[PDB]
Design a protein around this ligand. Sequence first.
Ligand code: G3H
Ligand code: G3P
Ligand code: CA
Ligand code: CA
Ligand code: CA
Ligand code: CA
Lengths: 325, 325
Amino acid sequence: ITLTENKRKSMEKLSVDGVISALAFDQRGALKRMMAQHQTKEPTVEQIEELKSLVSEELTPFASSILLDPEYGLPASRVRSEEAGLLLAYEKTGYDATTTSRLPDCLDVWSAKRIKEAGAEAVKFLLYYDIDGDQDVNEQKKAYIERIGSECRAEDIPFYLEILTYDEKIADNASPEFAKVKAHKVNEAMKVFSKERFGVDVLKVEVPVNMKFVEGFADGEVLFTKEEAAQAFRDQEASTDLPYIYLSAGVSAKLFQDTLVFAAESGAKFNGVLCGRATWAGSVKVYIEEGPQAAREWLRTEGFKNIDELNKVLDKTASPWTEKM
Amino acid sequence: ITLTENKRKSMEKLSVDGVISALAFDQRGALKRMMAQHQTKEPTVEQIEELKSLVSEELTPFASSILLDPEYGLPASRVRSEEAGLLLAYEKTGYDATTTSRLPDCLDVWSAKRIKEAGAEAVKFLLYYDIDGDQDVNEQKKAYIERIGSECRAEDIPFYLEILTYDEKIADNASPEFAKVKAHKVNEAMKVFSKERFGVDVLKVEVPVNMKFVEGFADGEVLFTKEEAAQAFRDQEASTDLPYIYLSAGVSAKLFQDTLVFAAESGAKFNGVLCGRATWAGSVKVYIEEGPQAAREWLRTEGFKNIDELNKVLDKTASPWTEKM
Ligand SMILES: O=C[C@H](O)COP(=O)(O)O
Ligand SMILES: *[C@H](CO)COP(=O)(O)O
Ligand SMILES: [Ca+2]
Ligand SMILES: [Ca+2]
Ligand SMILES: [Ca+2]
Ligand SMILES: [Ca+2]
């Protein structure tokens, strides 16, 4: 539903047996903030590019594909395992914090055609979306996604749409107040962007619940029973017929793995993950303070353990996207 | 050079016997300024939408198609002649005069898909381009046209690219200084955007010379001879294999008509025109002052006479785009 020959071939290069076990490292401003916590000077371009190349070289042998940004990640893309596919990010990093609109914007000197010419098997785009937000803002966001979806249809390259939800009136998405509305924000946004007019091939989405407030997982206030959390996962599955994959949102590797198990037990038929920080977060401190060689040894030990255990979990929880397309 | 079935059918709906005799009325800010100089109050949306409808309803019976803007011309597009095709402008009007980059920008809540859904047979986009300008600026512009070209391929709708040339250093493009380089600006820009990667189907371009400085046409200072001018047109013909049409550029109708004859004599194989103010400008004064009914009679008399004379010149100067495709 309903891949062209070329789009199918690219999807196969990004997955194994219909499951996407992709490594995500297109973070730019978020990576800079992480490195800023560990050194005096400002993170330089050589540091950004080198660290991306280390993660790509050491960990892509254990992923079906890697997501990188064209601004700092092109060197890293050339050192990935020959068995791993490539996704390239298309959006500018971050958003304007002085306003609530968080309007999307493509990299200035890039296009879907140039992403394909750079060797990518997919275009990835991040959209911030408040389903309950200003209707004129959301009309502009939907028109923008339509353009990108049309680009990808013309270039015949899969369109991976990442949706991060928020509320114009809630400052912290980690708060209990946002947790109470998160399922609504996520599942209704997925329903909108599963419409044919947007040309999405795979949705990259948050889990529809903040697991730190679910019974059995919560260390403090409990907002949801397990059955209530399970129902949010079943609503998410009932919100789209497209393939969708989960992002880690920077939670610990263990919590993300436990969440995937819970998702599968609840009835969610997710088709993999695009997991970033939960895998390689710890390499940042080591690289900045210890250097590149020490970072390699971290990736070969702690990094491998994160992605290896994730792969074991994906093997028993994820469903193949070939059942949907 | 090649067209899909639907792109070819749309091109036929925009032309007559392979000739494009299109009426241009996508003006917005410029039209508002023409109205402001005839009344005290500020022009209203109702006035703008009504005048576009009068022009569309009265003059489209004598044109192969009409170019309108989605912001005020959608009512006018519905009262157009059944035999006239529709083109819709896609770009935001004007440019920021505080800088020299003149970067393109699409209408916020529009896309090629929505333009097609609004009933258009083609997408029209305007690009300001200085072939000698800042290389990074032009790289961003080229990337931008690639996206729009890809959209139009996906939606299977002809892409009409309008190129207006300028110089980052020369303020007035009507000056003698700019006339001595206009041929370089026009012809070289046509070479760039004739490349397959931009997906252009038709170019809306200026004549490669300021005829007001050509021997026999200039009422004062003479910069070029007819032989030098004729060579500029032959260079323009040799700069693209795509169909291309001339824009009136606001010059007098008589001068524009004489330029089409001179172009055909020099060897230019242009495929039509997109003429606007030179055909209907006189109705603005009548409409604002004498009202909508007086403007209608002006269009049925003087307005018809203008477009009728133009069509008679086109029948003796324009070449069919079917000979290039
Ligand atoms: O630039 C600021 C953003 O919050 C960082 O996120 P990003 O690196 O994924 O674009
Ligand atoms: C998506 C990045 O583009 C996945 O990032 P993550 O750290 O897992 O949330
Ligand atoms: Ca091999
Ligand atoms: Ca489903
Ligand atoms: Ca299973
Ligand atoms: Ca005619």
